Design a protein around this nucleic acid. Sequence first.
DNA 1: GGCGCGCGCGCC
DNA 2: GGCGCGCGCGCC
Length: 183
Amino acid sequence: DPVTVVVLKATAPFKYESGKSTMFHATVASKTQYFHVKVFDINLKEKFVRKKVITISDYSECKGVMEIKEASSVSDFNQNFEVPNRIIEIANKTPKISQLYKQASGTMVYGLFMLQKKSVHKKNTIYEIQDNTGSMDVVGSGKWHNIKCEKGDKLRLFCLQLRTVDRKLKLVCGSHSFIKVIK
DNA sequence: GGCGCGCGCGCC
DNA sequence: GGCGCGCGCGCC
């Protein structure tokens, strides 16, 4: 059903494969929840700006993440719209590596984590991330082999998937994964 | 090329 | 939710 939200975050459009297309990620908030959104129509980028209020209908979902394909289904909302501020806070919280270690393979993961160790191999790059509860490997290939970063930088992860790899839960990149290196 | 407008977002 | 530095990018 149609849902009206306020945009909290939205990345710049980026290239990806399976067919090779374009997309960006966004995070939005109703008055009762926050959601991650994959937008596959890059002509909607102007509707997904910080603080813009939009109404989303005729979309699809997948593991709690919204998918938007046709611009025909986003409309501006210019009446008054206020979301409770904890929804904003939750929407911006990065989960703990100790909780990530307790979810099922398949779970999609988004957050900001600091990069403690970078190991580059032939086709894969293992980015070790840490917080005050644990460490975890991020596996990046293709677009995310050997990206520019060093110890102390932080990584913003968008739509990474928890997978068991050599008997341990890791984050691995797929077609829609995005990683941004900060500072 | 490369100015300069004005956002993004980590930090506050 | 505000701030402002760093930057992305339309324009010439």
